[PDB]
Scaffold this active site. Structure first.
Site, short mmCIF file in Angstrom:
data_model
loop_
_atom_site.label_atom_id
_atom_site.label_comp_id
_atom_site.label_asym_id
_atom_site.label_seq_id
_atom_site.Cartn_x
_atom_site.Cartn_y
_atom_site.Cartn_z
N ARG A 77 0.67 -1.28 0.04
CA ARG A 77 0.04 0.02 -0.10
C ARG A 77 0.73 1.46 0.08
NH1 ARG A 77 -4.34 1.41 1.69
NH2 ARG A 77 -3.23 3.37 0.73
N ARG A 87 4.21 5.38 -16.71
CA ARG A 87 5.04 5.79 -17.84
C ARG A 87 6.27 6.31 -17.45
NH1 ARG A 87 1.32 8.25 -21.51
NH2 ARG A 87 -0.78 7.66 -21.07
N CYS A 91 -7.52 2.44 -12.64
CA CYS A 91 -7.71 3.55 -11.54
C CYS A 91 -9.04 3.43 -11.24
CB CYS A 91 -7.46 4.95 -12.03
SG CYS A 91 -5.71 5.32 -12.70
N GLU A 110 -11.66 6.53 -4.99
CA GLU A 110 -11.84 6.30 -3.54
C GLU A 110 -13.35 6.68 -3.27
OE1 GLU A 110 -11.47 4.68 -1.05
OE2 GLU A 110 -9.40 5.41 -0.31
N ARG A 144 -4.01 6.80 -3.75
CA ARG A 144 -3.54 5.63 -3.03
C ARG A 144 -3.31 4.78 -4.04
N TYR A 163 3.75 5.85 3.25
CA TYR A 163 2.85 7.12 3.34
C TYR A 163 3.19 8.40 3.56
CZ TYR A 163 -0.71 3.53 5.02
OH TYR A 163 -1.41 2.42 5.07
N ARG A 208 -1.09 6.58 8.95
CA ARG A 208 0.02 5.45 9.33
C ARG A 208 -0.44 5.07 10.57
NH1 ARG A 208 3.84 2.88 7.92
NH2 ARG A 208 5.32 3.48 6.35
O1 LIG Z 1 -5.52 1.44 -19.75
C1 LIG Z 1 -6.56 2.00 -19.84
O2 LIG Z 1 -7.56 1.45 -19.80
C2 LIG Z 1 -6.27 3.44 -19.73
O3 LIG Z 1 -7.36 4.23 -19.83
C3 LIG Z 1 -5.26 4.16 -19.04
C4 LIG Z 1 -4.57 4.20 -17.68
C5 LIG Z 1 -3.17 4.65 -17.54
O4 LIG Z 1 -3.04 5.92 -17.72
O5 LIG Z 1 -2.48 3.76 -17.38
C6 LIG Z 1 -5.39 5.29 -17.11
C7 LIG Z 1 -6.88 4.94 -16.47
C8 LIG Z 1 -7.23 3.51 -16.29
O6 LIG Z 1 -8.06 3.26 -15.43
C9 LIG Z 1 -6.24 2.42 -16.32
C10 LIG Z 1 -4.97 2.93 -16.80
#
Ligand SMILES: O=C(O)C(=O)C[C@]1(C(=O)O)C=C[C@@H](O)C=C1
Ligand SMILES: O=C(O)C(=O)C[C@]1(C(=O)O)C=C[C@@H](O)C=C1
Lengths: 117, 117, 117
Positions: free
Chosen positions: A7, A63, A75, A78, A90, A108, A116
């Site tokens: 985490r 990247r 992503c 939250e 996070r 953290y 923490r």
């Molecule tokens: O791979 C994807 O589906 C993206 O949109 C790119 C990306 C990323 O920048 O790495 C961004 C948001 C997504 O939730 C997952 C990954």
């Protein structure tokens, strides 16, 4: 062959792409430093942000880490908690490791130090 | 024999149950085909949608895949990013596999083709 | 040794800290009992809540489980689906286990019993 979650948490001062990427990169680099993590050993990663951040996906920061281009990442938002820490990013980084659960180094940073245990 | 994440993404034109299930199924089938995945080797799956999709949980499409009734799946809301791809559905499928990280076949369909690296 | 996701779901009657913690604790205890789960074997956990719950992070309940202080957990927001179950907390607990996929014991409590296949 055991797998464990690592985490991380950090915060940004402003909702800008520059600050979200800078702080996310710094968090990942610290997790990598502390756990000696190699990208090929990462199963996958989940990044989340509180619903007050919108400028960019924090995963874009991955990247900027050389050698990490094949690490699968997604992503999510939250949960919005009343009185919760704001502007918070996070990480749940799932890795192949033989390090025991109690010695995994969770990280953290910034205003997330309050999280923490 | 390691554990690895497989990513997929796709889009729908309308927030309807029919199209969400159709595109999700098509995305899952393409992932399964490209990676030769058997359901018993799936640790778990996470599906996400942007906050503009409300008609149905994309996980319902898994019911349409023969033999996948015991694959554990849960859904979450994607982070809402300014200028981000609208009406987007993503998959993170965690599998046991011998395939090296750089050879895993991540899948991008419909308007999510722009997400490919 | 294979890894497997174990799903749980439950509901609360109102958005309060006491109810969220109690019902989340109860759900976790039932998963643990059914699957004989030991914390050292848990890779990680993800908890989610529908967007009508804001009082507290359900992850706070994990701290009420003796021995589970090192299990990494993070929370996320569940999609808002029309006609979807309200006030719902879900768990995806990722564990190392030999138990066949079809024998894993997923747990649905309170009003979430309607979710179970
Ligand atoms: O791979 C994807 O589906 C993206 O949109 C790119 C990306 C990323 O920048 O790495 C961004 C948001 C997504 O939730 C997952 C990954
Ligand atoms: O089992 C549950 O938790 C459900 O509510 C069902 C279901 C599904 O369609 O499979 C839908 C939404 C949840 O996020 C995860 C799975």
């Amino acid at each position: 062959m055991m797998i464990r979650g690592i985490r991380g948490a950090t915060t940004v001062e402003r909702d800008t792409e520059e600050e979200i990427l800078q702080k996310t990169k710094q968090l990942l680099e610290k997790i990598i430093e502390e756990n000696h993590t190699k990208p090929e050993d990462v199963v996958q990663m989940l990044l989340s942000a509180t619903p007050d951040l919108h400028a960019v996906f924090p995963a874009k920061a991955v990247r900027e880490l050389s050698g990490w281009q094949y690490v699968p990442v997604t992503c999510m938002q939250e949960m919005d908690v009343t009185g919760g820490l704001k502007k918070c990013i996070r990480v749940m980084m799932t890795v192949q490791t033989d390090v025991p659960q109690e010695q995994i180094r969770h990280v953290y940073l910034e205003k997330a130090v309050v999280l923490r245990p």
